[PDB]
């Protein structure tokens, strides 16, 4: 019946938007990660050792790392090791903690990612319009032989169109926030 069909359509459209929302949250928009500097070699009592074994690296923010050295006497050496890796990283030392601001993703990268979210959004929009269509079908078709008539078709078609509108609207909002994120730093 028509009671089923439309509630069936929005459950379908919801799944689409939600798949898009999860597919997109995977995309990182900044360089920040707790293991980003794990590979930096530090002079530790003669022996070169990866930074990972000498300090805790926490993500203070999307483009900044906070390095927590376990042995305070090693901080100076860690700071030199960071400058020395020649990654363009300007370590900012201050009070038992070293902070590491990070360069933004490259122009080329942002474009590769903008392109990916747009394609996924696009996919989400086609999926949503296919569900709309499948609904319209049942409705318009049921009009042929079984019980529904023009004014129930109209309303039903319009109620469905609006479901499509709200579903398309969520995808657009998820997309915009993501590009705003990408374009952020
Ligand atoms: C894993 C540690 C990464 C540090 C990244 C600094 C930014 C490098 C950008 C690369 O551009 C080409 O040289
Ligand atoms: Hg989808
Ligand atoms: Hg240490
Ligand atoms: Hg250690």
Curated annotation (Swiss-Prot):
SUPFAM superfamilies, per database record: Ribosome recycling factor, RRF
* Tagged with keyword Mitochondrion: no
One BP term from GO: cytoplasmic translational termination
Q: Name one GO molecular function term.
A: ribosomal large subunit binding
**Residue positions, PTM N6-acetyllysine:** 162
Task: Mention any one GO cellular component term assigned to this protein in its UniProt record.
Answer: cytoplasm
Tell me the keywords, alphabetical order: Acetylation, Cytoplasm, Protein biosynthesis
Q: Which InterPro entries does this UniProt record tie to the protein?
A: Ribosome_recyc_fac, Ribosome_recyc_fac_dom, RRF_sf
Work out whether the entry's keyword set contains Acetylation: yes
Q: Which domain of life is it from?
A: Bacteria
According to its UniProt record, where is this protein located?
Answer: Cytoplasm
PANTHER family the record matches? MITOCHONDRIAL RIBOSOME RECYCLING FACTOR PSEUDO 1, RIBOSOME RECYCLING FACTOR
As for what it does, the entry says: Responsible for the release of ribosomes from messenger RNA at the termination of protein biosynthesis. May increase the efficiency of translation by recycling ribosomes from one round of translation to another.
Family of this protein = Belongs to the RRF family.
Q: What is this protein called?
A: Ribosome-recycling factor
Organism of derivation: Escherichia coli (strain K12)
Q: State the gene name recorded for this protein.
A: frr
């Amino acid at each position: 019946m028509i009671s089923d069909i439309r509630k069936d359509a929005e459950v379908r459209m919801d799944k689409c938007v939600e798949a898009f929302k999860t597919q997109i949250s995977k995309i990182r928009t900044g360089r920040a990660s707790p293991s980003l500097l794990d590979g930096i070699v530090v002079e530790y009592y003669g022996t070169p050792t990866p930074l990972r074994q000498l300090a805790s690296v926490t993500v203070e923010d999307s483009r900044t790392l906070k390095i927590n050295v376990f042995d305070r006497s090693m901080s100076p050496a860690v700071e030199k090791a960071i400058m020395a890796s020649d990654l363009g990283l300007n370590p900012n030392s201050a009070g038992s903690d070293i902070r590491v601001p990070l360069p933004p993703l490259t122009e080329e990268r942002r474009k590769d990612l903008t392109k990916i979210v747009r394609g996924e959004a696009e996919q989400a929009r086609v999926a949503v319009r296919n569900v709309r269509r499948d609904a319209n079908d049942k409705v318009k078709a049921l009009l042929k032989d079984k019980e529904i008539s023009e004014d129930d078709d109209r309303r039903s078609q319009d109620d469905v169109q609006k479901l499509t509108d709200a579903a398309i609207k969520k995808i657009e909002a998820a997309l915009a926030d993501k590009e705003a994120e990408l374009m952020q730093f």
